Amino acid sequence: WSTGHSQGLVTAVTIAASDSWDSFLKNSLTAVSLLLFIGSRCLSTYPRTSLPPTMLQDSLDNGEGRPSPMLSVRDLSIKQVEKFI
């Protein structure tokens, strides 16, 4: 069996649909064209705007990352992260 994460799930359903060398290209083109629409419309719906330089310089000095719309929390349970959100 096979599966994909956040993005690569389209390559897992590419993987079971492709058979030969000609069939694999026809299903790969439907995959890379698909994630041009996931690519463009997720930026056209939520356009990233400029960030205040107080914020990102604080984030680099606190040991965090440059701010972006997804944030990874390690070392905490799911029941206590949702206590913080």
Binding site: P47, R48, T49, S50
Partner: protein, 84 residues
């Protein structure tokens, strides 16, 4: 009379690279227009003042030297519903 539409703002901010989130359209906030969109509203009123006969010059040697903006004290910035 120009009406500040939502499309005229986003084409303008993309042309000037203004990233600032107050100018892109988000729910829960009235979409604000650039203050440099003043010159888009008021170009055809400004450069009509160099066409009269009493100011007679070689227009092809015109040099734009300086421009300035000034919000009137107590005036709100431009919105996307404003008839201007």
């Amino acid at each position: 009379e120009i009406t500040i539409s939502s499309q005229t703002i986003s084409e303008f901010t993309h042309a000037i690279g203004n990233k600032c989130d107050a100018f892109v359209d988000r729910p829960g906030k009235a979409t604000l227009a650039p203050m440099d969109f003043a010159i888009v509203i008021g170009w055809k009123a400004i450069i009509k003042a160099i066409f009269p006969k009493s100011v007679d010059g070689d227009l092809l040697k015109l040099v734009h030297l300086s421009n300035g903006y000034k919000m009137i004290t107590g005036a709100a910035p431009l919105k996307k519903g404003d008839v201007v």
